[PDB]
Amino acid sequence: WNYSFSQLPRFLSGSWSEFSTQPENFLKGCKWAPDGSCILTNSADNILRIYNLPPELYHVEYAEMVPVLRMVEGDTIYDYCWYSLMSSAQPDTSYVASSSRENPIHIWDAFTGELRASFRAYNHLDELTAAHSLCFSPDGSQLFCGFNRTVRVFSTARPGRDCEVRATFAKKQGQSGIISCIAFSPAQPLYACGSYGRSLGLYAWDDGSPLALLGGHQGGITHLCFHPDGNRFFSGARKDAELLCWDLRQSGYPLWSLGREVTTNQRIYFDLDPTGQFLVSGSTSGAVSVWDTDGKPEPVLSFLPQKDCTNGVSLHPSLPLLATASGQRVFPEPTLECRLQLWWCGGA
RNA sequence: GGCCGCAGGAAGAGGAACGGAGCGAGUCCCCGCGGGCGCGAUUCCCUGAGCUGUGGGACGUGCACCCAGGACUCGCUCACACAUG
């Protein structure tokens, strides 16, 4: 099996009924586990849900999917992620990080759904500040997390308030604003921070010294992805039409610009293949766009999962499975239900 | 209750300004206090899923905050007052 967008993705079971419990609920992305065992979904009800990979794939009609875990947070969930080095063969690796409004960075066990650990970030007044982003290091030793004008680096082995603080803004110079996303280069010893203040920043892993500072985007940056090459990477923003392609060589200016309809203050996700050839992105209109990265990325396909915003898109690391999360904020007036969905993208 | 031992007294009950106040300084106590406020221009940006329009931020800029008390100690001032049947 291998990815192929020469044909439109075939439908595979999704979940709609449980999200319809609350009025005006909507999904806030979806993320495959790095081994490909299960998929994690955030929602406006502040409930992380884990769905197992469908048994009926390996076993035609599929039943509505049911989550093996529901792990409830008490406030808006800003970011969430799988452990970098997760495998379902090891209970010690299978866990989910999660940050929430005025709460610690919770670590949830991905089998039993219990609160396993808590990392706590305090300001100079000894008041708890919540992390707006999360990212494990490629070794899985450290947990990087973004705040206003600063990244903190907790050691995964020692859960608590202990952390290395890294200021990105010093005496009105550097990367300003809430750091909304962190991502590491597969090859290089660096990481990239996006901010709700328009700019991107590159930083060395060991020291946290600035390598570069990049403009480009016309809105607050929401997501980052490094290509498996290590040189090339991509970025996207809120209320901003362009998905910008970058390169670590020939730096300072984005090489290409890829169009997508983003008309809300949302984290509209995008994701690459495991091989790195295709790039998939959601849209506020709903249309999931696909580009072949191998020159400018060529448009391959556009299709519509539903008549609503496609906020989340996630590609499975081994199988040709596209996951799609839907929904958005409805705006009132003075006096369609959201859903996760799977899609087979394999060849004929 | 009685007896013995030890200890404190060997007591006639005094005194209608005694010995005070208010400031200032030094030293302690108290003591989570770069943040708070305003205006200007590209409506200065922003209904962010980021607190937030009963407010949040950026850049100019200016502005006002960081005490007041108490205790001890050494000055200056005002009294040294039993309150008029």
Side-chain angles (χ1 to χ4, degrees), chain A residues 16 51 65 84 92 144 159 176 184 190 202 243 250 261 279 303 313 318 325 327 335 340-341:
Chain A
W16 45 87
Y51 297 86
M65 300 202 305
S84 180
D92 294 6
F144 284 61
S176 185
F184 284 76
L190 65 86
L202 300 177
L243 185 77
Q250 199 182 0
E261 185 167 318
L279 168 57
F303 87 99
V313 298
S318 59
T335 310
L340 179 67
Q341 298 185 123

Side-chain angles (χ1 to χ4, degrees), chain A residues 93-111:
Chain A
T93 66
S94 299
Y95 59 85
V96 167
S98 176
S99 192
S100 177
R101 176 182 172 176
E102 297 192 73
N103 281 283
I105 300 166
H106 291 143
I107 304 300
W108 301 93
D109 191 284
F111 286 109

Side-chain angles (χ1 to χ4, degrees), chain A residues 297-314:
Chain A
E298 186 170 48
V300 172
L301 176 66
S302 303
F303 87 99
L304 188 68
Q306 68 287 301
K307 292 188 170 66
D308 208 335
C309 168
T310 300
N311 57 75
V313 298
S314 200

Side-chain angles (χ1 to χ4, degrees), chain A residues 286-303:
Chain A
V288 176
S289 298
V290 186
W291 301 272
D292 182 24
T293 61
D294 176 38
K296 186 167 182 175
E298 186 170 48
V300 172
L301 176 66
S302 303
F303 87 99

Side-chain angles (χ1 to χ4, degrees), chain A residues 16-26 43-45 47 49 70 337-338:
Chain A
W16 45 87
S17 300
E18 78 179 300
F19 297 115
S20 73
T21 51
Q22 298 201 155
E24 203 202 322
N25 199 356
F26 57 87
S43 165
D45 61 2
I47 300 174
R49 299 179 171 80
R70 297 188 182 74
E337 293 175 13
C338 57

Side-chain angles (χ1 to χ4, degrees), chain A residues 2 17 20 42 55 63 67 87 139 162 166 215 254 268 280 292 309 312-313 332-333:
Chain A
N2 198 355
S17 300
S20 73
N42 187 7
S87 299
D139 291 5
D162 311 352
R166 300 188 177 185
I268 306 299
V280 181
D292 182 24
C309 168
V313 298
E333 295 292 345

